[PDB]
DNA sequence: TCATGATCATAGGCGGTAGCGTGCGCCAGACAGGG
DNA sequence: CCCTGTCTGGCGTCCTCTCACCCCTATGATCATGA
C-alpha cells in the first residue's frame, strides 16, 4: 500500500495538495484510505533584535511544518502511474512510499 | 546600353585591378574618376559586348 | 577461382553457396551473437556480424555473371574503382578468430540499461530498468518525491510497451 | 525586420551546429498508431517543437498565467507551432562527405582550387583510387594519384613515414593543408615569369578564385560536409491522400535514405570494418 | 469565381489554386512586369506582401479594412523565409545583414 | 567580520573537505583497541603531522552574508540580525512572528 | 490432444540466375585528341 | 602548345478548366478441424 507524506509550511496549500492527490487517486483506482492529519512541527526561534546590546529585546519566530498522511490501499496499473505526470503545487514536499 | 555593360582593364595603374580582369564599367569609371580628380594617375579601360 | 569479398544478400547462404560449395568454395563474414527479445522472448542467434559483406570463392571469365545473377549473394564486388577489386582475406590469412569487442547485441539491452520503461499513459519520461530482472513485472523505476521504485510493468512491456 | 543586404557565404560546421536545436538520429517519421511522431526521427517534437499550439505532447501546461516554463515529461517547450517552421536539426555524418555543388558544377571549384583535374577528384571521392597526402622524402609527389598496385608498392617499400589516403577524408586533408599565402605568391611570381597564353589564362582564373577566396572569410575545408542540415518539418509536409496512407514527399525519402545509410555506417565503424572493407559503405553514403 | 479571403496553403503561406478549392487568381510574373512598367509601387507591394503571403500583415489588413483605416503594415513574405530555409539547408549560409 | 577572516574560514573548510578520509581513518586506528601499540603511536604522530586547519573543530560557523561569528543559527546559516531582516522582508519561507 | 492446413494480416524499393534505353535541338564552354 | 573535335551542361509561353491515379504479393502466425 502506498503511504504518501505531504509536508508544507502553508496549511491551506498543503490542504489543496491533499485534495488534489486524493482526486488523482480516486478516479483511477479505488478505496483511497484518507487524508489523515499528523501533528504539526512548530519549530521556534528566539533572537536578539538589537544590533549591539539589549538582551530583553527579542523576537520569537516559528515555522509550522504541516504533515498530511494520505494512503492508497490498492495500487493499480493506472493509478500509481498517474502521479508521475501529476506534479503538485510548489512549496509542498510530497513523499510517496509503497509498502 | 544594358548589353555592353562590362569592361576589361588594360593598365591597372594606381588602382587595385588586374591586367585581364573584367569589371563592370560604371565601377571603373567612378574609380578612375576619384583617382584622376586628385593628383594621381587613373585606370584606363576597354569595353566588351555581352 | 579465389576468395573475394562481395556485397551480397542475407540469410540464404546455402543456395548460392550450393552453386559455390558444390565446389571447394570459400565463404566468410564477421560474426556476432544476438540476444534479442524479439516479441516477449529472448532469442539467441550467433549470426554473421556484417550486412551483405561476404567472402566467396569463384572464377570470373568462363562462368559469366549474368547467368548466375538470378540468385542472392549479389549486390556487387568490392571495387574502390571500376574493376572488381581483388580483395585481401586478412581474416583468413592473419586474423582467423575474433569478435572480442563485445556481444553488445547492437543497441538491444543488457541489465541496467537506461531507456524507456513505460508507455500508454505513464511514459513521457525515461524511467529506468535499474535491472531487467525478468521481463515480467514490478512497480516502475519511477522517481517523484519519495523512494525510487523499479519497473511497473509486465512481460512485453518494460522496454517499449 | 529592417535590413539593407543579403549576404551569402559558405557555412562552417559550427554554424550548422548553432542553427540546429537537436540531432536527428532515426529515420522514422510517424507512429501510424496515432500520428504522434517518433522520437527523435525526422518529424520530431523535442527537436522541432509541439504539433499543437501551447499543446505540450505530454500535456501539463495550459494556463494564461503559466507561459515560458518548458515540459518535463516530453521536455517540449509549450510555445507555438509556427516554431516548427523555423527550427532546424542537424545530422552528424559518420565520415565526411563532398558537397556536389563544388565538385560538379563545371567549372569545379575544388577542381581549380587544388590545381587538379576533375577526373582524379572523382576517382578519389568515390573510393576507387588513392591520392597522396604528406608524401615525405620519397619518390612520390603531393598531388600524385595512385592505384591499387602502386599503393602496394608504396606500402611495401615505404610502409613507414609515407602516407596517402582516399575518399573525402583525403580531400579534406588536401584542402586543410592548403596554404593560401604561398599559392598567391607563387601564382603571382609565375604569371610574372612564365608568360604563356594558355598558362596565362588558366593561372589568372585560378588567382581570381584565390584572391576572391582570401579576401573573404571562408576556409577551403568547409566545402566538405561534416554536419548536414535538415529542413524544418513544415517545409517538407507529409500530405494525407485520405486513404489511410501517406504518399510522402520526395525530401523525406531522401533524408530517410541518408539516415539509414549513416546509421549502418556508424554500426559498421563500431564493430570494426574488415580491413579493406570500410569503403563501400562510405561510397554509398556519399552517393546518397 | 471570386475570393475575398479563403484557405491558405501549408508549405508556402499563399492562397490555394483552382475553383473547387476556393482559390485566388495567379498574379503571375508578366503582371508583375506590367506593374513595374507603370509607376505603381504600392499596388505591387500589397499585391505580393499583404494580399498574398505575410500572415501577420494580412490579419492587420483585415482588422484595418473592417475598421475603415486603409493602411498596410508590410512585413516580409513568408515564402522568402522558405527560400532562406531551402538555401540554408544546403551548405550555403545566407543571412540578412545589418 | 573582515574579508580576511572569511577567507581564512573558507580555507579551513577546504582543508576539512580535503583530509576527511585520512583523518577519520587515523582516528579509527587510534581508537581501535584490537591493534598494535606501535601502530597506535604511529597513528597519533601522523595525526600531528597533518595540518591543523584540517580539523573540523577548528572552523567557526559564521553568517553567510556578514561573516559575524556570534549570534549564529544553523537552520538559516545567518546571524540573528540578518535572520530577523529576512523574516521581516518575507524571504525566509514559513517563518513568522510567533505568539502563544 | 496434437498436427496440419487454410485464411488473414502485416510488412519494403530494376527483377533477375539479363536487359531494359532508340522520334529534339541549339549554344557554349571546358576537356581533351591530333599534330 | 595550338588548334579542333567531343562532351555534357544549360535552356525551350502564360493563365485557366476537367479527369484518373497514389502498392499488391509473400510470408508468418493463429485458429479450427480432423484423426
Automatic annotation (TrEMBL), chain C:
The NusG-like N-terminal domain, residue ranges: 1-99
* Gene3D superfamilies given in the database record: NusG, N-terminal domain
Give the matching SMART domains: NGN (SM00738)
An individual GO BP term: DNA-templated transcription elongation
- Specify whether Cell inner membrane is a keyword of the entry: no
| InterPro entries (alphabetical) | NGN-like_dom, NGN_dom_sf, NusG-like, Transcription_antiterm_RfaH
Family, similarity comment:
Belongs to the RfaH family.
Q: Which PANTHER family match?
A: RHO-INTERACTING TRANSCRIPTION TERMINATION FACTOR NUSG (PTHR30265), TRANSCRIPTION ANTITERMINATION PROTEIN RFAH (PTHR30265:SF7)
Briefly state the protein's biological role: Enhances distal genes transcription elongation in a specialized subset of operons that encode extracytoplasmic components. RfaH is recruited into a multi-component RNA polymerase complex by the ops element, which is a short conserved DNA sequence located downstream of the main promoter of these operons. Once bound, RfaH suppresses pausing and inhibits Rho-dependent and intrinsic termination at a subset of sites. Termination signals are bypassed, which allows complete synthesis of long RNA chains.
Q: How does it assemble?
A: Interacts with both the nontemplate DNA and the RNA polymerase (RNAP).
Q: What is this protein called?
A: Transcription antitermination protein RfaH
User: Which gene specifies this protein's sequence?
Assistant: rfaH
